[model samples]
Target: AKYTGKCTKSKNECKYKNDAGKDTFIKCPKFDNKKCTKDNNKCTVDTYNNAVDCD
Candidate 1:
């Protein structure tokens, strides 16, 4: 399993288009505040032009 959803990312945050794009400032996964951002470690999660990684 993976977070292959179409979402945008910011500083420690991300807005997923998984649902209806209505609100903004959606919290990103990768932190310990929830079960969405778990680095999963399945594959490389380089979002920024596949250059930098958050973990």
Candidate 2:
């Protein structure tokens, strides 16, 4: 199953859908992806030098 919202990471700030189907924002370690695979539909290149996604 997929999520309704997207998982976005910006400067360690994370935003995504929670277990209760609500948007949740929190702080996490920053990461970078050299390349996003085709199977990973949720991975997106962001302006924050990060990659993320959900639905």
Candidate 3:
């Protein structure tokens, strides 16, 4: 969970947290690791990827 480069649901996913968070997501084509959670201090990784985007 180191790639905090920031993207979205159309950008193949990116964006890690710094805590106390809301801008959260996962590789949820049908809810695999769902997290927009506000009080789960042991959760991380907003995974999705095709890479090569920072423009």
Off by over 4 Å in 1: 1-10, 29-55
lDDT of 1 by residue, 1-55 (tens): 1123223322443333223453333334456543333433222223444322233
TM-scores of the candidates in the order shown: 0.22, 0.29, 0.17
Model 3, span 1-55: residue lDDT tens: 3334433434234354435555644442323443223322222233354332332
RMSD of 3: 10.6
lDDT of 1 at 51: 26
Ranking of all predicted structures according to lDDT, beginning with the best and ending with the worst: 2, 3, 1
Displacement of the residue 39 alpha carbon in candidate 2, Å: 21
Against the unseen true structure, what C-alpha lDDT does each candidate score? Answer: 0.34, 0.37, 0.36
Candidate of highest TM-score:
2
Q: lDDT score of model 2?
A: 0.37
Q: In model 1, what is the error at residue 27, expressed in angstroms?
A: 2.8
Q: What is the lDDT of residue 25 in candidate 3?
A: 47
